[PDB]
Amino acid sequence: EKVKVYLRIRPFLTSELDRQEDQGCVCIENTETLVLQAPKDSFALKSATHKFTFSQIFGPEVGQVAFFNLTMKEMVKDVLKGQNWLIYTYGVTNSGKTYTIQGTSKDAGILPQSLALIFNSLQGQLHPTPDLKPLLSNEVIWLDSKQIRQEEMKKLSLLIGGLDTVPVSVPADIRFSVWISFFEIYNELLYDLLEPPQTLRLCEDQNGNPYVKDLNWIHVRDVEEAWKLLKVGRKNQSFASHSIFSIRILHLQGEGDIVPKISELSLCDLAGSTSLHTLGRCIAALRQNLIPFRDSKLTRVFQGFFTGRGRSCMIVNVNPCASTYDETLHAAKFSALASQLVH
């Protein structure tokens, strides 16, 4: 029950349905079992049935709002209450990964819907001044006038690109500060995406916890600012991989004498096709019970989610096509809870 795996199967295109791509390769036996079969009429010149277990399987008919409510809504609510959530996303060729993550202007993905829910819930309870920065998952730094002015300019340079969800309940006595970071892991090297268009170093805490040194945490006042930073972040990624987008909420309880608390909602966009192999070993060891999180930079970044300082889950996007069967079988073998070979 540790790392829940959700499978989302993309609907068939009218074009792909005509190219004989529907051969019964991807089948939902039940809400937890995916049945994979080799194509009937092979696209390659030639002449296997596999069963896979997932936490829940959401078929092609499952829309954006329904998918969000059945998976993400509870996790975003958990984060608003004080817990830490990490959502891994998987997909290689035309899987529906980006439609699930960001989506269209109307059919908004899990990331815009989460940001919308956060700001709808925290509405009228936001701490105006970006006074305290959650530089660490457990620590806050105080910013002076010079530092606030400097952080505002970096934010402004990004926003100008250089040169209805029903809310969740939150206690009335708390004030909130929302901060965002966005970085990429390209060939074991870390790159900041919230930098106006150089690598980042992974350092150990004063208590032994790793963190990304000099990574930009941008204070966000509303959903429009958060959305723009994701767009600017993806534009920088497209200018130049594992895409890590983090939302950190600073909770300020009480009047006069304040008690600060930090919660986090992180989304990891895993690259298709070694770091993936270590993550598999790390998730398996986490579900089992030491975890070999140091054997990779990706698992070192998310050390907190393997040491009990947060909860993890995975969303796997699948292409139902017969030409992508071989890619679907690797994705299933990698992400599934259990795997059976039908004899």
Domains located in the chain, CATH noted: 61-319 (3.40.850.10)
Q: Tell me the binding residues for ATP.
A: 91-98
Closest among 219, 257, 221 to 132, alpha carbons compared: 219
Three-state SS letters, the chain: CCCEEEEEECCCCHHHHHCCCCCCCEEEEECCEEEEECCCCCCCCCCCEEEEECCEEECCCCCHHHHHHHCHHHHHHHHHHCCCEEEEEECCCCCCHHHHHCECCCCECHHHHHHHHHHHHCCCCECCCCCEECCCCCCCEECCHHHHHHHHHHHHHHHCCCCCCCCCCCCCCEEEEEEEEEEEEECCEEEECCCCCCCEEEEECCCCCEEEECCCCEEECCHHHHHHHHHHHHHHHHHCCEEEEEEEEEEEECCCCCEEEEEEEEEEECCCCCHHHHHHHHHHHHHHCCCCHHHCHHHHHCHHHCCCCCEEEEEEEECCCCCCHHHHHHHHHHHCCEEEECC
CA distances from 57 to 17, 248, 341 (A): 22, 29, 19
Instruction: Please check whether residue 65 is in contact with residue 107, taking contact to mean a CB–CB distance below 8 angstroms.
Output: no
* C-alpha to C-alpha distance for 269 and 326, rounded to whole angstroms: 21
C-alpha closest to that of 147 among 128, 126, 129: 129
* Burial class (CB within 10 angstroms; exposed 0-12, middle 13-18, buried 19+) of 309: middle
In sequence order, what are the residues at sequence separation of 6 or more whose Cβ sits closer than 8 angstroms to the Cβ of residue 201?
190, 212, 213, 214
What sign does the CA torsion over 158, 119, 95, 295 have? positive
Strands 242-253 and 174-186: antiparallel
Which technique was used to obtain these atomic coordinates? X-ray
The position carrying tokens 């992180």 is: 266
Q: Residue 259: beta bridge partners?
A: 253
Tell how far CA 215 is from the center of its chain: 18
Whole-Å CA distances, 328 to 7, 23, 72, 91, 316: 11, 14, 23, 9, 10
How far is the C-alpha of 92 from the C-alpha of 111, rounded, in Å? 19
- Between CA 247 and CA 254 the distance in angstroms is 23
State the Cα–Cα distance between residues 246 and 268, nearest whole angstrom. 9
Q: List binding-site positions.
A: 91-98
How far is 228 from 193, CA to CA, in rounded Å? Answer: 12
| CB-CB contact of 187 with 242 (8 Å) | no
- Neighbour-count burial for 234-253, b at 16+ CB within 10 Å, e otherwise: bebbeeeebbbbbbbbbbbe
Give the dihedral of Cα atoms 13, 16, 22, 25; nearest 10 deg. -90
Chain centre distance of CA 159: 22
